[PDB]
Amino acid sequence: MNTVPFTSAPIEVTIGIDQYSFNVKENQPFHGIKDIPIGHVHVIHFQHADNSSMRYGYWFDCRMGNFYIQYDPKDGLYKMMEERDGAKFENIVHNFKERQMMVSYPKIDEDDTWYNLTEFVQMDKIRKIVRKDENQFSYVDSSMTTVQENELSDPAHSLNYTVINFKSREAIRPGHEMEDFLDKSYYLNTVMLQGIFKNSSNYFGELQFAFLNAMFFGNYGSSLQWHAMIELICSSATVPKHMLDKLDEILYYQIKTLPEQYSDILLNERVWNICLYSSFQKNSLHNTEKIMENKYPELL
Amino acid sequence: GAMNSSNYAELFNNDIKLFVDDTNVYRVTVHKTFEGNVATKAINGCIFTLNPKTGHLFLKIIHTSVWAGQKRLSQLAKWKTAEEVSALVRSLPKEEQPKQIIVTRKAMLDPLEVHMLDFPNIAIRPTELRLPFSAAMSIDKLSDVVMKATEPQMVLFNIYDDWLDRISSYTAFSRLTLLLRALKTNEESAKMILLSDPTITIKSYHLWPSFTDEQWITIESQMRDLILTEYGRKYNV
Ligand SMILES: CCNC(=O)CN(CC)c1ccnc(C)n1
């Protein structure tokens, strides 16, 4: 079990750790978060009391270093930093725990939610989407745009998701215009899976990471990316049976975890009705359809 | 964006554009089978591609052999149309391709966009006008060449005959849409009007009769009467 200590909490903030969150009051004696399960990526995120604008946060993996949070009063945010001196770090963490100034990552033992939302997410791939290679952790916020969004303006602060575009020469083979547009198996299987992602786990990994950035930050490009990667599968007549079965599991837990009241901005009616009811795979997502219909029948 | 009443005069500027109508690409007769079921028999069709400024009609005939063994023919007709329009642009010198192509039905937008991905500088647009181009198979000589075709074929017409020698493109387009609107609303009467005077002939190389200016104004007035009338007979007014 790992620890992210906080230097202090000088400003009132809502703190998120994966799918959990709690309120810290201005100058409350708060020194961080403990018992963080090793073995998964994690995300620690922030929404200030004063400015509910700009949710922001850090993707990280405790196996890749000792990380702490420290408010910067110049830049005005909770910043993730790495402590290289490891003895200093252990000693700082031990004191805070002895004084019990840390909240405990509150995992129920029956609960595989986080593992199910992050099964294919790998920190090394997050770092290729979010380019800032001097840190081992990755900052995201509400307003970052995607590489594809900049094509339609600062490239250093972009989300480098995989560009998916159904009306592109990459998606459409000359002479198979109708065939490739109405059945995207070539684009999915040859172009994207075999060519760009190499395997279905890397693809699912980006798709999961896009969904999490959309939920936790309201990042609109991330939402577009999630829906696009779903639609590309759902609009392919030929998809390996194992991929459909995992896709169905993946979506199910995303739909289960979404805030009930955010459903109107993170879920695209057109994509979902198409995927569940008109597409090649309309019969293939039994778990996802059943949860969608019982929880968000308005959308359909 | 879309083409409507407000930007109607863009059709006659000097940017080369076409109208593409696909409403007569896939045509069928519907008949009873011996078993008393229903079956369709396809008949030849055409793509109506029209340069509105010069009157050039690039009439692509769609021979029934192109549907043989194909499923979902209404959908393939859209893609077939896009494929042929694309082939025509590509056949053409750069300075001769369309800067825009306006499709008369929105279902054509995606097929044509996808077929024209190689021409990112050609704009593909819908329109909010209810243009009467489906009535082009009521022009006897067009219908004849389509029905006689034994193979895929492209025939080039000027749907304005020699009218641009005397009137502008704006006016020629408006005459054409009025004639076609009339043919669509009541083809018999429309055609009675155009051929009532055996002294006014259609030259062998034209589609419409050789009317003088004064004779066109009367014809044009009679066609508006027809269109107003059929509107009553239809709605009781
Ligand atoms: C096909 C879009 N181009 C035009 O309309 C131009 N247009 C010039 C009058 C003609 C005429 C004859 N042939 C061709 C091919 N083009």
What is the full DSSP assignment across B131-191? --GGGGGGSHHHHHHHHH-SS-EEEEEETTTTGGGTS-HHHHHHHHHHHHHHHHH-HHHHH
The Cα–Cα gap between A223 and B175 comes to: 51
- What H or E segment, with its residue span, contains residue A177? helix A177-182
Strands A102-104 and A32-36 turn out to be parallel
CA angle A59, A64, A66 (to 5 degrees): 90
Enumerate the residues of chain B whose CB falls inside 8 A of the CB of residue A172. 114, 117
Which residue from B104, B107, B105, B102 is spatially nearest to B123, judged by alpha carbons?
Answer: B102
CATH of the domain at A243: 1.25.40.550
The DSSP 8-state label assigned to residue A1 in this structure reads: -
Q: Which residue has the tokens 């979404």?
A: A258
How many other C-beta atoms can be found within 10 angstroms of the C-beta atom of residue A182? 15
d(CA A197, CA A169): 18
Q: Is A54 left (phi over 0), alpha (psi -120 to 50) or beta?
A: left
Q: Which residue in A137, A157, A141 sits closest to A149, CA to CA?
A: A157
Contact B27, B44 (CB under 8 A): yes
State whether A167 and B82 contact (CB < 8 Å). Answer: no
Q: Does A186 contact chain B (CB < 8 Å)?
A: no
Cα–ligand 1 centroid distance for B23 (angstroms) = 22
- Tell me whether residues A178 and B113 touch, CB distance under 8 A: no
What is the distance between the alpha carbons of residues A233 and B80, in angstroms, rounded to a whole number? 26
Phi, psi at A4, each rounded to 5°? -115, 100
Sheet containing A102-104, strands listed edge to edge, beginning at the edge strand earlier in sequence: A2-5, A32-36, A102-104
Neighbouring residues of A297: CB distance < 8 A, sequence distance ≥ 6: none
Phi first, then psi: give them for residue B49, nearest 5 degrees: -110, 125
CATH code for residues B164-237: 1.20.80.40
Q: What angle do CA A252, A255, A257 make, to 5 degrees?
A: 105
Residue A140, domain extent: 116-299
Question: Three-state SS for A93?
Answer: helix
d(CA B95, nearest CA chain A) in Å: 24
Dihedral sign for Cα A293, A294, A295, A297, please.
positive
Is the minimum CB–CB distance between B12 and chain A shorter than 8 Å?
no
In terms of phi and psi (left: phi > 0; alpha: psi -120 to 50; beta: otherwise), the region of A27 is left
Nearest to A172 among B76, B83, B117 (CB): B117
Ligand 1 atom closest to Cα of residue B58: 1
A14 Cα: distance to centroid of ligand 1 (angstroms): 65
Q: For A180, which residue in chain B has the nearest alpha carbon?
A: B114
* Mutation target vs A (from B114, B116, B122, B124; most A CBs, 10 A cutoff): B114
Structural resolution in Å: 1.8
Spatial separation of the C-alpha atoms in residues A203 and A193, rounded to whole Å: 7
Tokens of B97: 């391709």
The token pair that represents B206 in the structure block: 């034209």
Q: Distance (Å, rounded) from C-alpha A70 to C-alpha A76?
A: 11
For residue B76, the chain A residues in CB contact (below 8 A) are 178
Other Cβ atoms closer than 10 A to B2: 12
d(CA A290, CA A252): 9
Angstrom distance (rounded) from CA B7 to CA B52: 14
Contact check, Cβ <8 Å, B118/A172: no
Q: Which residue type sits at A90?
A: E
Closest residue by CA, ligand 1 atom 16: B96
Per-residue DSSP letter, A261: G
Q: Do B111 and A169 touch (CB under 8 A)?
A: no
CA distance B44 to B66: 10
Question: Quick check: CB of B214 below 6 Å from ligand 1?
Answer: no
Three-state secondary-structure class, residue A241: helix
Instruction: Give the B window 132-191 contacts with A, CB below 8 Å.
Output: none
The answer to whether A167 contacts B113, with C-beta atoms less than 8 Å apart, is yes
Residue corresponding to tokens 């069709």 = B45
Q: Would the CB atoms of A169 and B117 count as touching at under 8 Å?
A: yes
Choose among A52, A65, A63: nearest CA to A23: A52
Nearest to B141 by CA among B205, B207, B44, B190: B207
Token pair for residue A285? Answer: 């997502």
Residues 76-95 of B with CB under 8 A from A: 76, 79, 82-83
> Measuring CA to CA, which residue among B104, B42, B99, B102 is closest to residue B76?
B42
Cβ–Cβ < 8 Å for B73, B42: yes
Chain A's closest residue to B115, CA to CA, is: A177
Q: With CB atoms and an 8 Å threshold, state whether B79 touches A178.
A: yes
A154, two tokens: 């600062």
The tokens describing A206, both together, are 């980006």
The residue type at A171:
A
Residue B194 near ligand 1, beta carbon < 6 Å: no
Contact B115 A177 (CB under 8 A): yes
Q: Check: CB of residue B122 under 8 Å from CB of residue B90.
A: no
Rounded Cα distance between A125 and A122, Å, is 5
Distances (CA, A) of B82 to B18, B23, B48: 13, 13, 12
Side chain identity at A145, as an amino acid letter? Answer: T
**Is the separation of the CB atoms in A129 and A206 below 8 Å?**
yes
A129: CB partners within 8 A, 6+ apart:
A138, A159, A160, A161, A206, A209
Distance between CA atoms of residues A89 and A70, nearest Å: 14
Cα–chain-centroid distance for residue A62? 17
End-to-end CA distance of chain B: 37
With CB atoms and an 8 Å threshold, state whether A172 touches B111.
Answer: no
Give the separation between CA A157 and CA B145, rounded to whole angstroms: 62
B114 touches chain A (CB under 8 A): yes
Is residue A197 a contact partner of residue A162, using CB atoms and an 8 Å limit?
Answer: yes
H helices present in chain B, as ranges: 73-90, 109-115, 140-148, 169-185, 187-195, 213-235
HSE value, Cβ hemisphere, 13 Å, CA-based, for B228:
6
Residue B51 Cβ inside 6 Å of ligand 1? The answer reads: yes
Alpha-carbon distance of B33 to B14, in angstroms, equals 53
Residue A58 parent element (H or E) = strand A56-60
What's the start-to-end Cα distance of chain A, in Å? 42
Exposure string of A196-234, with b = 16+ CB inside 10 Å and e = fewer, is: ebeebebbbbbbbbbbbbbbbbbbbbbbbbbbbbbbbbb
Give the alpha-carbon dihedral of B108, A239, A273, A293, to 10 degrees.
170
User: Distances in Å between the alpha carbon of B205 and those of A265, B23, B60, B161, B189?
Assistant: 61, 25, 18, 8, 24
Per the CB < 8 A criterion, the answer to whether A21 and A215 are in contact is: no
Q: Are A180 and A171 in contact (CB under 8 A)?
A: yes
Just give the CATH number of B9-163. Answer: 3.30.420.230
Report CA-CA distances (Å) from A66 to A2, A103, A125, A133, B217. 9, 18, 20, 16, 89
* Helix or strand run (H / E) with residue A230: helix A220-234
Closest CA to ligand 1's atom 11? B56
- Residue A161 to residue A163: CA distance in whole angstroms: 6
Tell whether ligand 1 has an atom less than 6 A from the beta carbon of residue B50.
no
Reference A205, options A193, A217, A216, A215; nearest CA is A193
Q: What count of other Cβ atoms lies within 10 Å of the Cβ of residue B86?
A: 21
CA distance A151 to B65: 43
Which residues on neighbouring strands pair with residue A78, listed in sequence order?
A: A71
**Residue A184: how many CB atoms within 10 A of its CB?**
27
d(CA A206, CA A120): 8
CB–CB of A60/A44 below 8 Å? Answer: yes
Cβ-defined contact of B114 to A169 (cutoff 8 Å)? no
CA-angle at A111, arms to A106 and A113, nearest 5° = 95
Q: What is the DSSP letter of A191?
A: I
Burial environment of residue A15 by CB neighbours within 10 A (0 to 12, 13 to 18, 19 or more): buried
Domain spans, chain B:
9-163, 164-237
As a whole number of angstroms, the distance between CA A259 and CA B52 comes to: 54
- Does the beta carbon of B153 lie inside 6 Å of ligand 1? no
B115 to chain A: which residues are within 8 Å by CB? 177
User: Ligand 1 within 6 A of B158 CB?
Assistant: no
Nearest Cα of chain A lies from the Cα of B79 at a distance, in angstroms, of 6
> Within a 13 Å sphere around the CA of B237, how many CA atoms are in the beta-carbon half?
7
Nearest CA in chain B to A181: B114
